[PDB]
Write a protein that holds these residues in place. Structure first.
Motif, PDB file in Angstrom:
ATOM      1  N   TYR A   1      -3.770  -1.961   8.495  1.00  0.00           N
ATOM      2  CA  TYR A   1      -2.553  -1.481   8.930  1.00  0.00           C
ATOM      3  C   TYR A   1      -2.914  -0.177   9.791  1.00  0.00           C
ATOM      4  CZ  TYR A   1       1.243   1.317   7.077  1.00  0.00           C
ATOM      5  OH  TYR A   1       2.232   2.275   6.966  1.00  0.00           O
ATOM      6  N   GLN A   2      -3.846   0.727   9.378  1.00  0.00           N
ATOM      7  CA  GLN A   2      -4.269   1.849  10.181  1.00  0.00           C
ATOM      8  C   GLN A   2      -4.779   1.273  11.474  1.00  0.00           C
ATOM      9  OE1 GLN A   2      -4.550   5.111   8.672  1.00  0.00           O
ATOM     10  NE2 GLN A   2      -6.020   6.254   9.917  1.00  0.00           N
TER      11      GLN A   2
ATOM     12  N   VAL B   1      -1.740  -0.639  12.740  1.00  0.00           N
ATOM     13  CA  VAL B   1      -0.577   0.146  13.096  1.00  0.00           C
ATOM     14  C   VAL B   1      -0.801   0.963  14.331  1.00  0.00           C
ATOM     15  CG1 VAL B   1      -1.069   2.253  11.798  1.00  0.00           C
ATOM     16  CG2 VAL B   1       1.305   1.565  12.207  1.00  0.00           C
TER      17      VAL B   1
ATOM     18  N   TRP C   1       0.826  -1.191   0.000  1.00  0.00           N
ATOM     19  CA  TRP C   1       0.000   0.000   0.000  1.00  0.00           C
ATOM     20  C   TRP C   1       0.833   1.202   0.000  1.00  0.00           C
ATOM     21  CZ3 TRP C   1      -2.904  -3.051   3.839  1.00  0.00           C
ATOM     22  CH2 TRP C   1      -4.042  -3.596   3.253  1.00  0.00           C
ATOM     23  N   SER C   2       1.916   1.070   0.691  1.00  0.00           N
ATOM     24  CA  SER C   2       2.528   2.173   1.315  1.00  0.00           C
ATOM     25  C   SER C   2       3.384   2.959   0.334  1.00  0.00           C
ATOM     26  CB  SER C   2       3.408   1.419   2.253  1.00  0.00           C
ATOM     27  OG  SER C   2       3.235   0.065   1.822  1.00  0.00           O
ATOM     28  N   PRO C   3       2.829   3.983  -0.259  1.00  0.00           N
ATOM     29  CA  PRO C   3       3.747   4.924  -0.860  1.00  0.00           C
ATOM     30  C   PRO C   3       5.142   4.452  -0.409  1.00  0.00           C
ATOM     31  CG  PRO C   3       2.400   5.966   0.861  1.00  0.00           C
ATOM     32  CD  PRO C   3       2.110   4.511   0.900  1.00  0.00           C
ATOM     33  N   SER C   4       5.578   5.012   0.727  1.00  0.00           N
ATOM     34  CA  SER C   4       6.890   4.964   1.317  1.00  0.00           C
ATOM     35  C   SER C   4       7.154   3.529   1.520  1.00  0.00           C
ATOM     36  CB  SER C   4       6.910   5.716   2.646  1.00  0.00           C
ATOM     37  OG  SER C   4       6.952   7.115   2.426  1.00  0.00           O
TER      38      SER C   4
END
Lengths: 761, 51, 102, 153, 51
Positions: free
Chosen positions: C91-92, C95, C58-61
């Protein structure tokens, strides 16, 4: 870390240490020198590790394995001891064999209707189990088993004819037991060995027989299956018996063995004419290796007499009917250097160069592995609680532990302290001695601490030496339990290396009966700070014996030991464990940790489930208080302790520049190291969850508190570190090992120790 | 040096094959060297470390 | 699952004595069905990992080393479990709350 | 009517509201801007309303509907939570499968007399129910059902 | 129950039934906003809030 100093070895550790081992606290230290020289050439097994279960699942059964299983329970056994086992057991047995009727119930409960033998039909009731519990009615299991075993014998003639029925599978643990030593212990073995038949016996014979009538067809066992079960059963019981001294049965044998042994004559007693050459004795003479009977017999008690020799015994029966040949209990049957074949060493000392600091010990598992299980007792009626894998906890405990694997398996402690000696110089040289210098074993610490005694401390007298003595059915009587083996720690590596024998019975101030051991001589280097004696004739005499191993070059093991650990759950799921309860609840630990700043508590709490933290609580996960690490980490606790004290002290009076600086950084090194690999253990995860936990909680306690513009936090600073250490107990919480002492004692040392940064991360 | 040697832990005094750790706090250490050389001007107090 | 149409009971003239046999049968492979029964891995685990991975993707980064991967995905389950990100915020949700999985 | 104000939305409702949603009460309000862009394209059902019952009436039974029924209880379930459900359930299950005998009772309670298998005859006792409760004897329904479901199996 | 959830530090007064349930409410309530933020107007990244 209990220990001793060569002059003070007797001077203090004098109790634990064997010059006492005999009566002779006495006038002069045993020894001198003398007469009949030999070394036995045998202890027996390797028994440790070697964890494992059995199923005694089925009735047609075992002749003799079960009693061996019984000795297992024995040690777990609340009721001590074995002798007790056998005799109480004889009581239950008596009851069954004697009584026809009790058997009315068993009988209905099968084919068991009313009428008899209900001929060809086959009638569908038989469970495994499910008689078994039917049986479990008559006498409650003092330790039942005779709940299962009688059921098996009940299963054994009972299922050969279309009356074989409930299908079972069974499991019961492996177990760590000692050297194995006590005079009694032979006796226990002997009674068990009576079981070893007397029992086996009950198993023995049996019948394929009026089946039931056959007689068209099989067929009404009038009572006949019931009747049959007794009729010659306890009547098997009255062809059953077993007789002579369990305590007797050898005591005599040993006295005789001692005669033979004894330099200083057995006098009239003598090797003798069909007496020996026996073809049992010789090498039971041989077997002296399970030496110190007379040492173990002589010291403790003050006598035995052959009493029953006959002449043609003992022999013929006289020494020959023997438990030892049976080799039941993990006493440890085997050749010689194995139980040697693991030992642990220290070298190396220095300069003086032998005396000063040198522990021997060994290798170890840290096999990661430990386990989850749930106790889902499926019935009451008794305790058993089938069980399995429940993993998530078991594995990760382990998962963590591999970086746990990283350190603190032994040599970390050994090497550190040992080298720790260079610091400190210097070469005092003989004033301290000597030292016990040598000792930190899995061997006991495991033993009563795993048995909850916590006997690693138990030395504490045993070092201090007059015997604790504060008896309780479980109580020192157990420090007694620890004691014979602990006496056994020294000897055995004194045992291998360097057979050099006689010596004499220490004639004494009293008390000649027979009371002897071999003069622990070998060779020696020339130049001595050693012991009570000075003796440069190759060796030392020795009432040591170990110092010769102290003398005794490092060598340092081969010896690969490292425990193993079980796999009950996969076998459980199929069938029930009973090692239990042993394990306990036992899902600790749960902690709350404050966060450091000014004028504010900044408290942080950990909820136990939370590192596992999978939501929210699991109800009855139970773990063993599984050992091993406890002992190992415990040597750890001591030496970071030991050394520090020493270095500190050297800085104190020598006194004078040269010493401190080095020790102090080096203290330095030790501290730095600790803080960081504490980082590594402590964080590394699952810990990290701690660490966040340190953050989440504190942070919203910060936001919850109100005004955060000045919240730092985490970049750096011990507060940077403080996270690392809170992770540090935390990982080392939910170990079954430590305790919580470790931390704060750790914590304290580490904290001022230094921690000096930088360097995280 | 004597002191480094001496801070060679705590010397070679037991010279042997020994020194193994702790070299970020002897930058911080060579602060300890400050008694021999004053160093508000950290430079050497920092620099003396480097070598 | 499984279950049986089976010694009914004897049949054998006719149906007929299930010795214990109906009882026995019920277990015998039942919990023995139970020992062909099991089921294993992380309920918590079983995805936690899956989600971390989803986040990587997902993560851009970067997921950096983690990566879409070679039979790793194209999986024909994941893609659109990647798709299924809509049940986003794992993950939100993973996380924030907790601080990790691997 | 709890709510918030755009400046104070974080300023107060800041907790409910998702800029918190993450750790980052933090230094600056999440955001800035950046890297891998997407929207998932899925939550799943509409579940609300859609009230309805089931009968798990009969033994030849269901492969998998019942656990879904179990998740229902779960939420009503006093005992939380599901994870708990499954594992406690594993415990009851263990008990039944493991144990031959407990089955002596079920067995009499049917064809279940003494002797076995009582051949062609058919013996009139079987209630729905009325075993079921016979079953209901062995382990009390922590949430029984395994009162009904085991009865169905 | 919002009342904190508005007020925001979490009630936290746990009991087997208890906020642990305000916890139960919380994920969905977080869900009230998003989802109509979810439909409309996909416009993505952003980043992990490095933090």
């Amino acid at each position: 870390g209990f220990n001793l100093k060569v002059k003070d070895l007797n001077g203090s550790a004098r109790g634990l240490t064997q010059a006492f081992a005999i009566g002779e606290l006495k006038n002069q230290l045993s020894v001198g020198a003398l007469q009949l020289p030999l070394q036995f050439t045998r202890t027996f097994s390797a028994s440790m590790t070697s964890e494992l279960l059995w199923e005694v699942g089925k009735g047609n059964i075992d002749p003799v394995m079960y009693a061996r299983l019984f000795f297992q329970y024995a040690q777990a056994g609340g009721a001590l001891s074995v002798d007790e086992l056998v005799n109480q057991f004889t009581e239950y047995h008596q009851s069954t064999a004697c009584n026809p009727e009790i058997w009315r119930k068993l009988t209905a409960y099968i084919t068991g209707s009313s009428n008899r033998a209900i001929k060809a039909d086959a009638v569908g009731k038989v469970p495994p189990t499910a008689i078994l519990e039917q049986l479990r009615t008559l006498a409650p299991s003092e330790h039942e088993l005779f709940h299962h075993i009688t059921t098996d014998f009940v299963c054994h003639v009972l299922s050969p004819l279309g009356f074989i029925l409930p299908d079972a599978a069974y499991v019961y643990r492996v177990g760590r037991t000692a050297t194995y030593p006590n005079f009694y212990a032979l006796v226990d073995c002997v009674r068990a060995s009576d079981l070893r038949r007397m029992l086996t016996a009950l198993s023995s014979v049996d019948s394929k027989m009026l089946q039931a009538t056959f007689k068209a067809k099989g067929a009404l066992a009038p009572a006949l299956i019931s009747q049959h079960l007794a009729n010659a059963a306890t009547t098997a019981f009255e062809r059953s018996r077993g007789n002579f001294d369990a305590n007797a049965v050898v005591s005599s044998v040993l006295t005789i063995l001692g005669r033979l042994w004894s330099p200083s004559t057995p006098k009239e007693l003598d090797p003798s004419a069909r007496l020996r050459n026996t073809n049992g004795i010789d090498q039971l003479r041989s077997n002296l290796a399970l030496f110190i009977a007379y040492q173990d017999m002589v010291k403790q008690r003050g006598r035995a007499e052959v009493i029953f020799s006959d002449e043609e015994l003992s022999s013929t029966i006289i020494p020959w009917f023997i438990e030892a040949m049976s080799e039941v209990s993990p006493f440890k049957l085997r050749p010689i250097n194995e139980t040697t074949s693991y030992i642990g060493q220290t070298s190396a000392i220095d300069h003086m160069g032998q005396p000063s600091h040198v522990v021997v010990y060994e290798d170890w598992q840290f096999a990661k592995e430990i386990t989850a299980f749930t106790p889902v007792k499926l019935a009451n009626n008794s305790n058993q609680r089938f069980l399995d894998v429940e993993p998530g906890i078991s594995d990760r405990m382990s998962a963590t532990l591999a970086p746990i694997g990283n350190t603190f398996a032994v040599s970390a402690f050994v090497k550190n302290r040992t080298a720790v000696y260079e610091a400190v110089s210097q070469r005092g040289t003989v004033n301290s001695n000597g030292a016990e210098m040598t000792l930190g074993f899995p061997s006991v610490v495991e033993r009563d601490y795993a048995l909850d005694r916590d006997p690693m401390v138990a030395i504490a007298a045993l070092r201090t030496g007059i015997v604790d003595e504060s008896l309780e059915a479980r109580a020192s009587n157990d420090l007694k339990r620890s004691m014979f083996n602990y006496y056994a720690a020294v000897m055995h590596y004194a045992v291998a290396h360097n057979p050099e024998v006689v010596v004499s019975e220490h004639q004494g101030v009293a008390a000649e009966q027979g009371s002897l051991y071999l003069v622990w001589n070998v060779r020696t280097e020339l130049r001595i700070p050693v012991g009570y004696n000075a003796i440069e004739g190759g060796s030392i005499r020795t009432p040591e014996p170990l110092e010769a191993i102290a003398y005794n070059k490092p060598i340092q093991p081969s010896e690969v030991l490292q425990a193993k650990v079980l796999d009950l759950a996969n076998h459980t799921t199929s069938i029930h464990i009973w090692p239990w309860h042993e394990a306990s609840t036992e899902f600790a630990y749960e902690d709350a940790y404050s966060v450091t700043i000014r004028n504010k508590r900044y408290t942080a709490e950990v909820k136990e489930f939370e590192l596992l933290g999978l939501g929210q609580r699991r109800e009855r996960v139970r773990i063993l208080k599984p050992t091993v690490a406890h002992a190992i980490i415990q040597m750890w606790y001591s030496w970071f302790v030991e050394d520090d004290r020493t270095l500190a002290a050297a800085r104190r009076t020598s006194r004078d520049d040269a010493e401190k600086l080095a020790i102090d950084g080096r203290r330095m090194q030790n501290a730095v190291t600790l803080l960081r690999k504490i980082e590594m253990i402590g964080t590394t995860g699952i810990g990290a969850s701690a660490v966040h936990l340190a953050q989440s909680r504190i942070v919203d306690q910060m936001a919850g508190r109100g005004l955060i513009d000045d919240s730092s936090d985490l970049h750096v600073g011990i507060n940077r570190h403080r996270i690392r250490i809170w992770a540090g107990l935390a990982v080392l919480q939910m170990m079954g090992l430590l305790s919580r002492s470790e931390a704060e004692a750790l914590t304290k040392v580490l904290g001022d120790s230094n921690a000096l940064g930088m360097v995280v991360a």
